[PDB]
Design a protein around this nucleic acid. Structure first.
Ligand SMILES: [Zn+2]
Length: 124
DNA sequence: GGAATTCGATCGAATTCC
DNA sequence: GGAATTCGATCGAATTCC
């Protein structure tokens, strides 16, 4: 299931993931989208790692993540969410993909907290 | 009937292979 | 180093015991 990353993303501030626990979550930063756009991906896992890797490279974004979180993103692992936003063993930020019942649209990909992601996939 | 386990949709992430 | 395979997690409806 290889494809091309497409999308304009969206402008984010220094409170990027604050609303990552409500609705569909935080959007894909335009800066990040410009770095992934047009690139191929062999799977969503690939896209996920490359995504967090990019975030660790954006100065304005990394400053929002503790040293430990930045270390994880530097190798492709997702940053750890607040302790109250986890769900059992799932304690890392997750990427939600919006798409019809019937492909890497960065305008349909968002960052959510395990807690919030579980509700979404059960109606809320 | 009701408890126990299965399993498919959604995920992160490690292991395995050339 | 990159890509495919395998491992786990969560949830709960559907399905399998007993
Ligand atoms: Zn989702």
């Amino acid at each position: 299931k290889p494809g091309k990353a497409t999308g304009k993303g969206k402008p984010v501030n220094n409170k990027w993931l604050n609303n990552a626990g409500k609705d569909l979550g935080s959007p894909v930063p335009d800066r990040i989208a410009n770095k992934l756009r047009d690139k191929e991906f062999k799977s969503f896992d690939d896209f996920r790692k490359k995504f967090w890797e990019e975030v660790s490279k954006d100065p304005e974004l990394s400053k929002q993540f503790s040293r430990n979180n930045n270390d994880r993103m530097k190798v492709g692992k997702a940053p750890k969410t607040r302790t109250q936003d986890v769900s059992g063993k799932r304690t890392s930020f997750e990427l939600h993909q919006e798409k019809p019942i019937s492909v890497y649209d960065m305008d349909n990909i968002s960052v959510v907290t395990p807690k919030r992601h579980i509700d979404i996939h059960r109606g809320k």
